[PDB]
Amino acid sequence: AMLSFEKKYRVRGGTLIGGDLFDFWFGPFYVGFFGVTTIFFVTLGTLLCVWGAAMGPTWNLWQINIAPPDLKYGLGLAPLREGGLWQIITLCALGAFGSWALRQAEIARKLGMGMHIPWAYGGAILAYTTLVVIRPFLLGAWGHGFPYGIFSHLDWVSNVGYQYLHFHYNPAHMIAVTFFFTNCLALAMHGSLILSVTNPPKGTPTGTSEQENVFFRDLLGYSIGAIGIHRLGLFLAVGAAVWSAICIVISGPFWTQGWPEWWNWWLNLPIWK
């Protein structure tokens, strides 16, 4: 089925690989070559997660836990029953997430859009790749990855935090948190402003860019403008994930003490040592 304006847009072209062979739709979805590779990796990676649940202790959704290998296996593939399955699923996940971004690039090209959406999603892929490839590689064992399980990965986050005694003191983490919180504020403001001009009190004319510009200036003391608020949202949201990736990759590979004692440099500046 198609939107009442859609058919006009369903042309060939814009594919990065495979020419016309995969250039077609399946219901709402565009396929394309990276559509095919997406479904391959999604299906394989999902069915291996189901197998990980089957050979584990329970089917309870919250408790399923596909753990990485012991650190003693280093950068090798463990026995599948001992974390090797987690490694294969990780390769599936990387394949899926990469295919998804490249498929989005084909869709954007076919509509004459800029590439902004694939690159924004690249920020999430970077954070994932840091957690399961780059940081475990710099530490020398794939077992430093997080387990695939809805609550068991929160146990991993907890224990990694306390490996540095007081993870709140991580300086890059403070920046990343500030981006996440400021992003949520900015999203609430932008959402509210657009809705409040397009949905005024009953018996009131539809508002204008001038009214939202005036109200925004009353809120922040300056006028961001229509292009600017979307630039700011993208900057805050993607910047949050980039600073997240930084804050975890420095924890272990680069800094190994508690995070509070990192701040010793500030206390020892020569103006006040």
Binding site: M55, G56, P57, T58, N60, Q63, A67, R81
Partner: protein, 55 residues
């Protein structure tokens, strides 16, 4: 209780009185993990409750 009987003739494991061809192992889930039954069972593995404070 820990292993099935072994036939002295052949070194061969007997399950419910009849031989198995192969080397028998007791099946377990990943790393021998077992779902926690309830709060009371978790608490029964812990130390007793802390004593009242000295104020």
């Amino acid at each position: 209780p820990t292993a099935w009987p072994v036939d002295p003739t052949t070194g061969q494991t007997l399950i419910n009185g009849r031989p198995v061809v192969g080397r028998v192992f007791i099946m377990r889930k990943t790393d021998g993990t077992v779902k926690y039954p309830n709060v009371a069972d978790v608490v029964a593995h812990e130390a007793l409750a802390p004593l009242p404070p000295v104020v």
